[PDB]
Amino acid sequence: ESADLRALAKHLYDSYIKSFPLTKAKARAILTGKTTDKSPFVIYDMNSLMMGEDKIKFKHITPLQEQSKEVAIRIFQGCQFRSVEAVQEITEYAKSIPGFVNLDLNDQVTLLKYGVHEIIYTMLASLMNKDGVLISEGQGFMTREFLKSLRKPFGDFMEPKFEFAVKFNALELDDSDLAIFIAVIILSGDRPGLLNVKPIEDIQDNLLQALELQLKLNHPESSQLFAKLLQKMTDLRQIVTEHVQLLQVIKKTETDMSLHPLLQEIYKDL
Ligand SMILES: CCCCCCC(C)(C)c1cc(O)c2c(c1)OC(C)(C)[C@@H]1CC=C(C(=O)O)C[C@@H]21
Ligand SMILES: CCCCCCC(C)(C)c1cc(O)c2c(c1)OC(C)(C)[C@@H]1CC=C(C(=O)O)C[C@@H]21
């Protein structure tokens, strides 16, 4: 079993590296001083925000129609394209989790519907420190306090993720850890409406075994870490429930929103 749980762990890490362009290790190097790379552009207020476009070569430019909208909404709408990119990254990773692709295709949809955001906030942590977050493959850094300064209820979106990220990062996980962790989250057989719970649980039992050992070998100086991570898995579900609640408020209180259709599909019946 042991050499095979290491094989599964390595196979996952390899896909993880293949799937997600920006690793925690890289993000961490940029966040600390510790890279040759030029340091990112800091967006710390409205003025630096406007300079963003000139300084960062990022992948979504706002079209003519959407240019007259208020900054909160533009920021709100801008960021959706990254989530979309995340969604397929996550899908590419899912496809490589040994046994996932052989599930009922509807169950494939359901685990993805429920995991994408748990995984996004997990991975978002890696990009965070107490001051703000890396944006555009780490070419930029938006301050936590700037995001917070946005008018209600837009200044309320990121705080709870930052609240999560500060604590989660204190566990000092790395990419190997996170590769298995991400895997255990997707293959969760307790998601509403699943068709065949058992084949999912069988995979997850295997991933959890790999996680436990991986944390054993990789974290000498912290008893109870594996349990803390299970509690995180739960913590994450509440972040998203908070997050869909706030999204509902946006829908009912704001006039010129544009919720991206792929995201709308994921959010639909959570
Ligand atoms: C009120 C909603 C806040 C959500 C923002 C979350 C946060 C700070 C990780 C963020 C993510 C983003 O993708 C952006 C981003 C911020 O800011 C820009 C300027 C919109 C950025 C532009 C294009 C972007 C790019 O091409 O890199 C990304 C986009
Ligand atoms: C296109 C196949 C049928 C669409 C229905 C499925 C639904 C609504 C989840 C959806 C899936 C999509 O892939 C898109 C999508 C919506 O909306 C966009 C804006 C077309 C999106 C753009 C590029 C996309 C991207 O960046 O990957 C995806 C594309």
Side-chain angles (χ1 to χ4, degrees):
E1 191 86 289
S2 271
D4 291 12
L5 294 167
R6 303 311 298 154
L8 180 62
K10 186 200 183 282
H11 159 91
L12 293 169
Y13 170 81
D14 289 359
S15 340
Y16 175 92
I17 293 301
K18 227 263 283 289
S19 282
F20 309 100
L22 190 57
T23 67
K24 176 162 174 194
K26 223 277 166 284
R28 232 65 245 170
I30 292 160
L31 283 181
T32 56
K34 212 182 272 76
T35 175
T36 76
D37 266 349
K38 47 136 52 178
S39 68
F41 186 82
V42 175
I43 304 167
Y44 63 87
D45 62 359
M46 292 301 152
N47 290 338
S48 35
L49 172 64
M50 303 315 275
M51 196 128 300
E53 296 89 298
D54 287 306
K55 293 273 181 199
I56 309 153
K57 171 192 190 181
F58 43 41
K59 293 178 274 317
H60 178 67
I61 316 97
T62 23
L64 288 176
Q65 329 92 280
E66 309 291 298
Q67 277 183 78
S68 65
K69 292 177 154 83
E70 60 174 286
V71 292
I73 296 165
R74 304 207 308 275
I75 294 182
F76 184 78
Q77 278 178 168
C79 89
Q80 295 203 300
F81 293 90
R82 175 52 215 157
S83 300
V84 167
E85 204 175 274
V87 163
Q88 160 121 120
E89 287 175 8
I90 287 149
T91 301
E92 293 299 301
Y93 187 67
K95 289 197 283 174
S96 76
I97 297 165
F100 177 84
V101 298
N102 301 136
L103 298 168
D104 191 297
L105 294 162
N106 294 290
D107 284 358
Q108 277 172 49
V109 174
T110 302
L111 308 169
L112 270 40
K113 261 194 175 75
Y114 282 86
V116 290
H117 289 89
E118 298 180 13
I119 308 314
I120 287 166
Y121 308 143
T122 288
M123 302 220 74
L124 203 32
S126 309
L127 272 21
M128 287 175 171
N129 64 177
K130 60 163 156 58
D131 286 346
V133 66
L134 287 180
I135 65 152
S136 341
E137 256 222 71
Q139 272 173 284
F141 186 86
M142 194 170 289
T143 71
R144 184 188 181 170
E145 209 65 51
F146 170 73
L147 278 152
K148 209 161 148 190
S149 87
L150 303 167
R151 79 137 164 98
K152 304 188 110 289
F154 293 110
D156 282 331
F157 261 93
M158 291 306 288
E159 250 330 78
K161 329 281 149 67
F162 272 105
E163 224 110 69
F164 168 80
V166 159
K167 292 187 297 140
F168 185 81
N169 293 354
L171 298 189
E172 283 168 337
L173 299 195
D174 60 29
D175 302 291
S176 306
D177 308 316
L178 283 171
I180 308 176
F181 184 76
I182 300 325
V184 164
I185 295 167
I186 307 175
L187 277 295
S188 41
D190 63 343
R191 311 289 202 179
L194 282 165
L195 290 165
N196 309 317
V197 159
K198 154 94 170 168
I200 292 158
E201 295 201 315
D202 279 356
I203 296 161
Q204 202 195 221
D205 285 345
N206 266 132
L207 299 166
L208 280 158
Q209 276 198 252
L211 181 62
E212 193 159 22
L213 169 61
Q214 161 71 202
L215 303 160
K216 187 187 260 192
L217 307 149
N218 197 49
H219 297 261
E221 276 186 305
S222 62
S223 157
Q224 263 94 52
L225 179 64
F226 176 71
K228 302 191 184 170
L229 253 59
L230 296 194
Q231 186 52 227
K232 296 303 178 195
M233 269 145 47
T234 304
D235 283 0
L236 284 175
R237 285 139 102 110
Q238 259 293 139
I239 309 293
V240 180
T241 293
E242 252 85 285
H243 181 75
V244 301
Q245 228 154 18
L246 217 195
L247 273 193
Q248 280 181 4
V249 181
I250 307 294
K251 275 263 184 65
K252 288 183 180 181
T253 78
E254 298 296 318
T255 86
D256 53 324
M257 280 330 108
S258 308
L259 213 207
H260 177 113
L262 208 211
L263 272 13
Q264 201 150 251
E265 262 300 296
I266 300 172
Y267 287 132
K268 216 210 179 289
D269 291 304
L270 283 193

